[PDB]
Structure formats: C-alpha cells, structure tokens
C-alpha cells in the first residue's frame, strides 16, 4: 500500500533521511549542546544519531516502528529546525543569544503553518539579500546593500524575527527596494541609502556594524559622489577634509548637504 | 390622435407579423432541415467508419 504516494520502501527510506538531516541540523546550529530544551524536544530522533547506527539499521527500526516514522510529523519537526538554522546562518557573523534562539524556536513550534509564516517570508528576503551579496562586486548599489544588510543582520540578531520591529521592517523594505532598483539609477540608489542613514534613530549607524576599511570606503564613495560639479577647489579640499571621518554619520551627510547648497549658490 | 396611433399600430403589427411568419415558415424550417441532414450525414460517417 502506498503511503503519501511513495512506495513504502521509499517512505521508510525518507524517514531515516529526515532523521539524519535533523541530526545534521542540530549538529550545525548547536555543536556544543547549549540548546538543552531543543535537544530534549528532538531527543527521540537524535538518539539514533548520538548513538552510531547504520543506514539499514535505522531503516529497519523505522520499518518496525521503533523510530518516529510519521513522515509528515517528521517533516514539520525538521522544517522548524531548518528555519531556525536559516535564521542562524543568515546572520552568521552576528550570532544571537540562547534565550532569543529558544523563544524563536517556541514561536516556530507554536506556528500553525511554518512554511507560510511571515517569519518564513522575512527569512526568504534576508537570504535573497545575502545571496545577492555573496558574489557581488564593488559598486555603490552593492556597497550600500552590504552595509544595510549588515545592520539588518545586527537588528535581526538583537530582536529576532517573530517580533515585527518597525526598524527591521524598514530595513527589509529599503534593502529590497535597493536590490530591485536598476544598476543605472545611481541617483536613486544614493537617495535611498542617504534616506536610510537619515531615518535610522542612531546618529552613526555603522560604527561597529562594519569593518573600518568598508566604512572609509563608504565615506569615500559619498565624497566622490559629492565631488563632481563643485564650483571651487576650496570646496573640494573641504570635501577631502570631511573624508577624514572614520565612518558615515548623519552630521557628515548634513555637512555634504551644506557644501551642496554652497555650490548651488555658487554654480 | 387615436386614429393616427391606430394607423401606425396597424402598419407596425403587419410588419411584425410578417417577420414572425417569415421566421417560422422559412428560417426555422430551413435550419431544421439542415440539422436533419447533418445528423443523417454524421450517421453515414459513423457507418463508413
């Protein structure tokens, strides 16, 4: 008799496959066994991984019912871990705390349909941005996106994803808008980047979010954009003096706007 | 006014009755004969097959 459309042999192979994948996910998001509640909640499947077995042994156990062999329940339980691992990996440099991880797990498990959850959509958007930036080459679009996604990962680690923080929603929307905008709309890319750095409550958003070299490169990018169409070499030297700033800042952008208005009068 | 309306209605009634008679004595019989012929010819096609 077919189960879920698969021949029973394939179903009982999929059961052991899911068990192995759950074990791998646990080893990935918690090699040190810090997440004790999660370990307890999944202990019935990780028993077959902590203790060493053969593939055929676990398959036989599943065929005899010793293993948890409800492939739908196993699929749900594995999807929870997979989503948690996606959250952990998407912010891999900006790891979060244990209590936050466990709260996110609990909200997952409570969710009726985790695949359709708004949590899943937010993770998809974050993975979209990260995948775009994994092999991206330097350009104002890509640099602004990298900085904005680093700060987005920081906020995600701070507040998780189950809480629809307004700042995180703004970061998602602005990052996606910048991503979708054409590479030739340079003025619009700079407009959105400067609007973000303006609307962030923190006066200097990227103080600790980015390495120093990238902060200086961002400052250089803004200075270079301000450079063309400057009526005086003195104003260009003032731009160079502003270039001494270690990182972008609201006041730095205001100084750029001040010089821009000076040139507006002078031009 | 009554007699003018009377003449106009007489003409319109004659025209509309002519239309109805033309339909039910020329057009509908034509289509019925066409349908009978089509049914017979499809029967012939089935017989040949």
């Amino acid at each position: 008799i077919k189960m879920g459309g698969l021949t029973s042999e394939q179903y009982h192979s999929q059961v052991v496959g899911k068990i192995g994948y759950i074990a791998r996910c646990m080893q990935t998001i918690d090699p040190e066994n810090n997440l004790k509640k999660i370990r307890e909640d999944y202990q019935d499947v990780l028993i077959w991984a902590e203790k060493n077995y053969r593939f055929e042994e676990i398959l036989e156990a599943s065929k005899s019912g010793k293993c948890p062999n409800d492939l739908d329940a196993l699929s749900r339980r594995s999807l929870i871990l997979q989503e948690l691992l996606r959250l952990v990996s998407s912010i891999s440099p900006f790891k979060m705390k244990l209590d936050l991880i466990e709260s996110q797990y609990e909200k997952m498990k409570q969710h009726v349909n985790l695949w359709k959850s708004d949590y899943h959509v937010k993770l998809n958007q974050l993975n979209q941005l990260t995948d775009y930036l994994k092999n991206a080459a330097p350009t104002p679009k890509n640099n602004f996106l990298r900085a904005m996604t680093s700060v987005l990962q920081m906020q995600i680690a701070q507040y998780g994803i189950t809480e629809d923080n307004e700042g995180i929603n703004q970061l998602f929307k602005l990052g996606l808008h910048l991503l979708a905008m054409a590479n030739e709309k340079i003025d619009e890319q700079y407009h959105l980047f400067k609007g973000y750095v303006k609307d962030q409550p923190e006066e200097s958003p990227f103080e600790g979010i980015l390495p120093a070299e990238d902060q200086k490169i961002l400052v250089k990018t803004m200075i270079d954009y301000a450079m063309p169409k400057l009526s005086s070499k003195v104003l260009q030297d003032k731009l160079s003096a502003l270039s001494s700033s270690d990182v972008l800042t609201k006041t730095l952008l205001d100084s750029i706007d001040r010089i821009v208005k000076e040139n507006e009068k002078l031009n | 006014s009554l007699q003018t309306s009377f003449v106009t209605l007489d003409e319109a009634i004659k025209i509309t009755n002519r239309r109805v008679n033309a339909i039910e004595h020329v057009i509908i019989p034509r289509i019925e004969r066409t349908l009978a012929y089509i049914i017979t010819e499809l029967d012939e096609r089935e017989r040949e097959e």
């Binding site: 459309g5 080893q27 979708a180 905008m181 054409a182 | -």
Partner: protein
C-alpha cells in the same frame, strides 16, 4: 544481447531474437543505431517504434538491446539548452557536425561532459551521514540565475562514503559516492530518469498562489495558479504571440520549460530566435531569458515517435527542476499534435480507435501528462516546495469543441481559456471567450485574494455578472431594438463595452501593456465597478423622481470621466511606478465621486 531486424514498415520495425526484451525498452536498430522503443512483444519478436527515419534499414540488421527505457539526462547544462524531442541537443549537434543537418543515428551526449562546473557540497554533509533520494548534496553555479541543486536520485539512499570537496568538476566526474547494504553506488552530477515515470514527491499540496500571466482577462476573470493545469487554444494572434513570451519575461515562475510538440518549421525558428534575445530585470540587472529557460524543439516533420516523447521529456525536465524547489512553468505547444502522433502510432499498431480515430487511451495519456503538474513538497531532506504549472495548447479541427483531444483535456485541466472566433475576427486580443472559459482555482485563490487584494473578489463577481448581463441584453438589442431598454440596462451595456474594450482588451506588443501587474488589474477593475455601482445608484435613486437621471445625462456630463477610465489601460508600470498608478486611479475615483456628487 542483441537481436536482428525481421521486418520494417515505416517507423515500425519488427526485430526477432528478442526473447528477454522488456516493453518500452530502448533499442538501437540498424548499423546506424537508430533509437527505437519496444512497444509490443510476440513470443521472441518485438515491435519497435523507431525515433528516426527507417529508410535503408534492411532485414537482418542488428538490433542492440539496451536495458533502459526512454530516459533523460538531468543535470547541469539543461538551462539555455535547445533539445530535440528525445533530449538530443540541437546546438551541440550543429557544433559537432559543422553542418545544418541532423545526422541519422547521431549519439552526442545530451549534457556536455567537457564543461567544468563550479560544484560546492552541502557543508553539513560528511562521510557516513545518511542521505536519501532527493537530498541536495551539492550546488552547481550553473549561471547567474539558476543555482543547480545536485539532488540524490530518487530511489537512491545510503551512507555517504565520499563527498567531493568544493571545486570544479565535469558532468562525468564522480562527485558523490554512497554505500547501502554493502553495495557502493557512485554518483556524478547527472542522473538518468525515465521520461514516462512520474518523479516522486513527499506530498502533492494544494495550489494556492496565482501564476500571473500578463493579461488582465486571464489574471482576473480566469485565474491560473502555480502548479495549475491549464488548456489554451493555439489560435493565431493569441497564444505564442504574447502569452508564452509574457510568461517567460516575468511571472511568479522561476524556470520555463517550453516544448514544441508539433511546431511548424518557421514558427519553431521564430521561437528559437526570439527566446535567446528576450531579457528580464532581476536584482536590478537585465539578464537573458535563456538563463532560466529550456526548449524542447520538435518540428512537424520529425519522426512521430519523437513527437510523442517530446511532451514527456518536457514534463520530466519540469519535474526535475520542481524537485529543486523551483516553480517551473511548462508550455506544451500542442497537445493536439501529440494526440495526432498517438493516433498515427495507434493506426500503425492496428489498434481499435475510439471516436474520430484516436486511441481509446487518449484520455489516459493526457491525464498522465497533465496530472504531473501541481505544487509539491519535493522529496529530499532539505525542506522545499516546488511546482510545475502545465499550460497545454490545443487546436481542434476548425475550432471544434467536441474534438476528442479537447474533450479529454477539459476533463483534466482545471483552467480552460477558450477561444472566441468572433473576437479573433474582430481583432479583439486576447480573444478569450469569457462565457465558456473557466478556472476552477478561484476558490483556492480566495485565501490569497482576501489577504493581498481583499477588494478584488467582489469586483470580479460584479464584472462577470455585468458581462453576462450584456450577453443577455445584446441578443435582445439586435433581435428587436434598442429603444425599450431601461436606464439600468443602458448602464450595464455601456459599462460592459467599457470593460470589454479597455479592461479585457490588452495589446501585448505595446511598452505599457506587454505585462499588466495585478495591482494595475485590480485597480482598473475597481474603478470600472465603482463607476458601475455609482451610476446604477444614480439612475435607480432618481427613478420615480422629478429630477430623473438617465445614461445619456451621465455620458454627456462626464465624457472626460469615461475617457479617463478608457485611458486607464495606458498606464505604464515601467515608468509610472506602482505608487504613481495607484495614486492616479485614486484620483480618477475621486473625480468620479465628485462628478456624481455634482450630478446628485
């Protein structure tokens, strides 16, 4: 090991000394090794439908007995590849032979074994880890768009005794190697899968997300969904003209598989010329459509067996990319030509036909093809949900609605975008006849609409009601006369004209109407139905009152409002952003309300 040819009759060979051969097994007939498939067994003789021209095949010719059925090589290299009906790569044939002819018995590999592929294993895997069929054990950077996820073949399983490190590997290099029951199976990046076998999935889930074509009529009145099963007429002006390329350029789908079952010569040339030149905006860059499209080209003069297997090859590739977690939109250029191939092969086999000469199993074959569509929780441990959305094109003789292929289609497909010959003659494109065309996915799409486009469902209901009322009123207007119409009937007729000419009429060659976003569709329909409701309110309320309002009064007062509603279709999403279009439609609604307030 190998039999001999006993007789030949067109594509139907009969090979002797085939005692142990299996049904639908592949064989190589002749000294040129023409591909053939065993379709019948009689003692020690096997009848073989040959996939190439059999001219020159003589009795006594060897018949090599390969042990596998008609199967496709699924792996890196499918994307951007143009394939014959049986997976033969036309571009590779041209490059290798340096001639414009397809040599008989050509045996070039479907997937090139010389291209170095950037392979990155799933980092969490290791030696000894348990894996099963469908497990994504590595990812190949096929191109900038499609990340080719290397999945363990279904019906394969075991403990990974070796996983290759990240690097560059051929399509023939052994990339993974796993042991089960002591037997070691070595897997490269290409897996061979029979075309006639349904690729297994964990669970076929309901389809609950629209598959947006570019047309307002199709998106609103007769929605399609991801994993849907649609039937579309192959009439000229519509179909291949806009809908196929519109689905290609932009839609919810992540991959396109396009199979030319019985395409005409120059029309297939048109497809093969246009597709490699279409581009799409992805992550702010214009990228070729070939980066996520594959074509299975099968011209009408190619062998009928290939024409029969073309649909199966296409749907198998679509299923393969569905298992990856992608949403593959498949287009069958003609299931009618497929049915013609089935009829011809049945006649050659001397089987008893059903009505109109088709084999009595035509419905079964159409079901086996269409039902392979759907949204699925793909096999394999890494959770993912793919879908295959089949759009099968039908073209009955003389637009016959009782054509056995069309009748068999309508009992399977959930969507059917029927053809109005009158609209086509009038040059009303799309020529969908909204009175018999249907879509059974509206109920499933209620959940999506009541959350994303909450106000759209009543608009669609009122639009359908208005169109049916116009259909009922036009018979009477033409049979008797237009003088006896009530005011509400006039509102219905003129609003139906408005909707038909400027909401259901979409020219797909213009920069502004090539693809109509669903926000544009729902906004336009909202404006038209708001005008309908408010005008009917005016005429009804002022009825039985001294200051009576009639359709003529409304039309004369606000010809500008009607003109603006008519020009609503001209909004161009590319330059008139979504916010701009929504604001303009809100302004039109405000003007309508103000003008009716002045009238009232």
């Amino acid at each position: 090991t190998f039999g001999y040819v006993h007789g030949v009759s067109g594509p139907v060979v009969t090979a002797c000394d085939m005692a142990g051969a299996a049904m639908y097994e592949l064989v190589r007939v002749g000294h040129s090794e023409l591909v053939g498939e065993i379709i019948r067994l009689e003692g020690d003789m096997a009848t073989i439908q040959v996939y190439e021209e059999t001219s020159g095949v003589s009795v006594g010719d060897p018949v090599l007995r390969t042990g596998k059925p008609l199967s496709v090589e699924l792996g890196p290299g499918i994307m951007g590849a143009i394939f014959d009906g049986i997976q033969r790569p036309l571009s590779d044939i041209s490059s290798q032979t340096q001639s414009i002819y397809i040599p008989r018995g050509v045996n070039v590999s479907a997937l090139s074994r010389d291209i170095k592929w950037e392979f990155i294993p799933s980092k969490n895997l290791r030696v000894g880890s348990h894996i099963t069929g469908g497990d994504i054990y590595g990812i190949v950077n096929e191109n900038s768009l499609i990340k080719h996820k290397i999945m363990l073949p279904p019906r394969s399983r075991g403990s990974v005794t070796y996983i290759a490190p990240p690097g560059n590997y051929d399509a023939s290099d052994v990339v993974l190697e796993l042991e089960f029951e002591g037997v070691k199976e070595k897997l490269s990046m290409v897996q061979v899968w029979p075309v006639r076998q349904v690729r297994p999935v964990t669970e076929k889930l309901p389809a609950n997300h629209p598959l947006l074509t570019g047309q307002r009529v199709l998106d609103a009145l007769f929605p399609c969904v991801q994993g849907g099963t649609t039937a579309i007429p192959g009439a000229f002006g519509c179909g291949k003209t806009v809908i196929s390329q519109s689905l290609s350029k932009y839609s919810n789908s992540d991959v396109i598989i396009y199979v030319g079952c019985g395409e005409r010569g120059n029309e297939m040339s048109e497809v093969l010329r246009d597709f490699p030149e279409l581009t799409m905006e992805v992550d702010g860059k214009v990228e070729s459509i070939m980066k996520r499209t594959a074509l299975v080209a099968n011209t009408s003069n190619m062998p009928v067996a290939a024409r029969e297997a073309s649909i199966y090859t296409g749907i198998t590739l679509s299923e393969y990319f569905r298992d990856m977690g992608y949403h593959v939109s498949m287009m069958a250029d003609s299931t009618s030509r497929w049915a013609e191939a089935l009829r011809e092969i049945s006649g050659r086999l001397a089987e008893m036909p059903a009505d109109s000469g088709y084999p009595a199993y035509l419905g079964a074959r159409l079901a086996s093809f269409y039902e392979r569509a759907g949204r699925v929780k793909c096999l394999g441990n890494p959770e993912r949900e793919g879908s295959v959305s089949i759009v099968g094109a039908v073209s009955p003789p003389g637009g016959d609605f009782s054509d056995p292929v069309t009748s068999a289609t309508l009992g399977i497909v959930q969507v059917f975008w029927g053809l109005d010959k009158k609209l086509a003659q009038r040059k009303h494109f799309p020529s969908v006849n909204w009175l018999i065309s249907y879509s059974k996915y509206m109920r499933a799409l209620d959940e999506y609409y009541d959350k994303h486009f909450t106000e759209f469902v009543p608009l669609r209901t009122k639009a359908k009601e208005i169109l049916q009322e116009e259909e009922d009123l036009a018979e009477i207007v033409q049979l008797v006369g237009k003088a006896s119409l009530a005011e509400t009937d006039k509102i219905t007729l003129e609003v139906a004209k408005l909707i038909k000419d400027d909401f259901l009429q979409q020219n797909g060659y213009t920069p502004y109407d090539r693809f109509c976003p669903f926000y544009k569709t729902v906004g336009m329909l909202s404006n038209m139905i708001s005008f309908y409701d408010m005008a009917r309110r005016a005429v009804e309320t002022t009825a039985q009152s001294d200051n009576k309002i009639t359709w003529s009064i409304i039309r004369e007062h606000m010809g500008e409002i009607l003109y603006k509603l008519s020009s609503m279709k001209f909004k161009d999403p590319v330059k008139d952003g979504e916010a701009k279009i929504k604001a303009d439609y809100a302004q039109l609604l405000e003007d309508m309300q103000n003008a009716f307030r002045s009238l009232e």
